[PDB]
Design an enzyme around this catalytic site. Structure first.
Site, PDB file in Angstrom:
ATOM      1  CG  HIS A  40       5.389 -11.512  -1.530  1.00 26.16           C
ATOM      2  ND1 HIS A  40       4.834 -12.133  -2.534  1.00 26.16           N
ATOM      3  CD2 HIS A  40       5.130 -10.170  -1.711  1.00 26.16           C
ATOM      4  CE1 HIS A  40       4.267 -11.233  -3.299  1.00 26.16           C
ATOM      5  NE2 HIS A  40       4.440 -10.037  -2.813  1.00 26.16           N
ATOM      6  CD  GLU A  52     -12.660  -1.213   1.293  1.00 23.90           C
ATOM      7  OE1 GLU A  52     -12.256  -0.639   2.273  1.00 23.90           O
ATOM      8  OE2 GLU A  52     -13.224  -0.603   0.404  1.00 23.90           O
ATOM      9  CG  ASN A  54     -12.886   4.593  -3.229  1.00 23.83           C
ATOM     10  OD1 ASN A  54     -11.860   4.676  -2.579  1.00 23.83           O
ATOM     11  ND2 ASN A  54     -13.258   5.614  -3.921  1.00 23.83           N
ATOM     12  CB  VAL A  57     -14.474   6.423   0.037  1.00 24.67           C
ATOM     13  CG1 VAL A  57     -15.893   6.933   0.458  1.00 24.67           C
ATOM     14  CG2 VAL A  57     -13.663   7.555  -0.607  1.00 24.67           C
ATOM     15  CD  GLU A  62     -16.770  -0.014   2.805  1.00 21.71           C
ATOM     16  OE1 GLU A  62     -17.818   0.159   3.399  1.00 21.71           O
ATOM     17  OE2 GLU A  62     -16.395   0.849   2.054  1.00 21.71           O
ATOM     18  CG  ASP A  84       4.770 -15.768  -2.387  1.00 25.61           C
ATOM     19  OD1 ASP A  84       4.641 -15.476  -1.213  1.00 25.61           O
ATOM     20  OD2 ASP A  84       4.773 -14.898  -3.243  1.00 25.61           O
ATOM     21  CG  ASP A 171       2.110  -8.433 -15.499  1.00 25.30           C
ATOM     22  OD1 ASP A 171       3.297  -8.171 -15.417  1.00 25.30           O
ATOM     23  OD2 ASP A 171       1.671  -9.430 -14.960  1.00 25.30           O
ATOM     24  CB  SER A 172      -0.875  -8.887 -11.395  1.00 27.58           C
ATOM     25  OG  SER A 172       0.234  -9.768 -11.568  1.00 27.58           O
ATOM     26  CD  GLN A 174       5.084  -1.200  -6.429  1.00 24.18           C
ATOM     27  OE1 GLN A 174       5.263  -0.057  -6.790  1.00 24.18           O
ATOM     28  NE2 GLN A 174       5.817  -1.701  -5.470  1.00 24.18           N
ATOM     29  N   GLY A 175       1.319  -4.371  -5.279  1.00 22.15           N
ATOM     30  CA  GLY A 175       0.037  -3.902  -4.677  1.00 22.15           C
ATOM     31  C   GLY A 175      -0.995  -4.991  -4.953  1.00 22.15           C
ATOM     32  CB  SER A 177       1.767  -8.884  -3.618  1.00 25.87           C
ATOM     33  OG  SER A 177       2.856  -8.827  -4.541  1.00 25.87           O
ATOM     34  N   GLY A 178      -0.545 -11.280  -3.448  1.00 23.87           N
ATOM     35  CA  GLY A 178      -1.454 -11.961  -2.519  1.00 23.87           C
ATOM     36  C   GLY A 178      -2.802 -12.152  -3.057  1.00 23.87           C
TER      37      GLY A 178
HETATM   38  N1  LIG Z   1       4.812  -8.203 -12.710  1.00 26.44           N
HETATM   39  C1  LIG Z   1       4.064  -8.861 -11.851  1.00 26.44           C
HETATM   40  N2  LIG Z   1       3.185  -9.738 -12.276  1.00 26.44           N
HETATM   41  C2  LIG Z   1       4.202  -8.622 -10.465  1.00 26.44           C
HETATM   42  C3  LIG Z   1       3.282  -9.200  -9.562  1.00 26.44           C
HETATM   43  C4  LIG Z   1       3.372  -8.970  -8.196  1.00 26.44           C
HETATM   44  C5  LIG Z   1       4.372  -8.161  -7.755  1.00 26.44           C
HETATM   45  N3  LIG Z   1       4.662  -7.785  -6.573  1.00 26.44           N
HETATM   46  C6  LIG Z   1       5.696  -7.015  -6.656  1.00 26.44           C
HETATM   47  C7  LIG Z   1       6.176  -6.397  -5.491  1.00 26.44           C
HETATM   48  C8  LIG Z   1       7.017  -5.301  -5.609  1.00 26.44           C
HETATM   49  C9  LIG Z   1       7.514  -4.644  -4.476  1.00 26.44           C
HETATM   50  O1  LIG Z   1       8.249  -3.673  -4.575  1.00 26.44           O
HETATM   51  C10 LIG Z   1       9.434  -3.800  -5.420  1.00 26.44           C
HETATM   52  F1  LIG Z   1       9.115  -3.689  -6.770  1.00 26.44           F
HETATM   53  F2  LIG Z   1      10.278  -2.761  -5.122  1.00 26.44           F
HETATM   54  F3  LIG Z   1      10.101  -4.994  -5.188  1.00 26.44           F
HETATM   55  C11 LIG Z   1       7.160  -5.094  -3.210  1.00 26.44           C
HETATM   56  C12 LIG Z   1       6.308  -6.197  -3.074  1.00 26.44           C
HETATM   57  C13 LIG Z   1       5.813  -6.854  -4.209  1.00 26.44           C
HETATM   58  O2  LIG Z   1       4.975  -7.947  -4.065  1.00 26.44           O
HETATM   59  N4  LIG Z   1       6.151  -6.847  -7.897  1.00 26.44           N
HETATM   60  C14 LIG Z   1       5.280  -7.584  -8.563  1.00 26.44           C
HETATM   61  C15 LIG Z   1       5.232  -7.794  -9.947  1.00 26.44           C
HETATM   62 CA   LIG Z   2     -14.370   1.546   0.665  1.00 30.76          CA
END
Ligand SMILES: NC(=[NH2+])c1ccc2[nH]c(-c3cc(OC(F)(F)F)ccc3[O-])nc2c1
Ligand SMILES: [Ca+2]
Length: 223
Positions: A40, A52, A54, A57, A62, A84, A171-172, A174-175, A177-178
């Site tokens: 995704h 990486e 920071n 900066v 890096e 995924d 928890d993990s 958005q951001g 991801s991957g």
């Molecule tokens: N709760 C979790 N463990 C989690 C993990 C990865 C995520 N990745 C995302 C995610 C959210 C995005 O924006 C959205 F909240 F509007 F859908 C976009 C890409 C994402 O991978 N939500 C996530 C939630």
């Molecule tokens: Ca840096």
């Protein structure tokens, strides 16, 4: 990462940031020319940033390398996020040292209760957006399949596993991801999805890497 802590510069040497003019996903270095991330996170114009800490900066260590190609799993389904996983080959090989290193692929799958380290530059608020400059870490256990399936009825495939805290707070997000879920020095998961972040009874769901090791080895070997 919500409820996590500052990892410390270069303490997670296999972590990479996927950048397209800004940080949009994490990834894991598995050899000097290949990175594993989530399907995704696919997009064109990806620059892989290694060493990486920071992300806003340049502080030294890096290595910014453009992706030569991204290989999304042929059976990736964007509506269920089943399979995924994506492999990215770098235009040149990275220089490995103590600050930049690859992580090993697992020989076996991990069991519930295994404690793992999840890291990333994803959101740190479960309500609102706060993105850190530096890498955050979280130690979380892999949950049993019953708790996972009880949390997301009908949304978990055998290529996914849940890890986290049902009480909420860590928890993990958005951001993140991957990025990597490493247990006992082996890459066991890839941050994939969850409902909101750090919500009670809604743990994170991760791609189960032990099910793709032969696919990863075969694809790297032919590309
Ligand atoms: N709760 C979790 N463990 C989690 C993990 C990865 C995520 N990745 C995302 C995610 C959210 C995005 O924006 C959205 F909240 F509007 F859908 C976009 C890409 C994402 O991978 N939500 C996530 C939630
Ligand atoms: Ca840096």
């Amino acid at each position: 990462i919500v409820g996590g802590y500052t990892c410390g510069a270069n303490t997670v040497p296999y972590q990479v940031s996927l950048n397209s003019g800004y940080h949009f996903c994490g990834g894991s270095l598995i050899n000097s020319q290949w990175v594993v991330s989530a399907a995704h996170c696919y997009k064109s114009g990806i620059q892989v940033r290694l060493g990486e800490d920071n992300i806003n900066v340049v502080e030294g260590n890096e290595q910014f390398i453009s992706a030569s190609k991204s290989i999304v799993h042929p059976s990736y389904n964007s509506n269920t996020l089943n399979n995924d996983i994506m492999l990215i080959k770098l235009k040149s090989a990275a220089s490995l040292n103590s600050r930049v290193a690859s992580i090993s692929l697992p020989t076996s799958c991990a069991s519930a209760g295994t404690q793992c380290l999840i890291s990333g530059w994803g959101n740190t608020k479960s309500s609102g957006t706060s993105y850190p400059d530096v890498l955050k870490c979280l130690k979380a256990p892999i949950l049993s399949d019953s708790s996972c399936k009880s949390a997301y009825p009908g949304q978990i495939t055998s290529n996914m596993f849940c890890a986290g805290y049902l009480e909420g707070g860590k928890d993990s997000c958005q951001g993140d991801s991957g990025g990597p879920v490493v247990c006992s020095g082996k890459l066991q998961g890839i941050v994939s999805w969850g409902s909101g972040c750090a919500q009670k009874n809604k743990p994170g769901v991760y791609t189960k890497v032990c099910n793709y090791v032969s696919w990863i080895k075969q694809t790297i070997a032919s590309n």
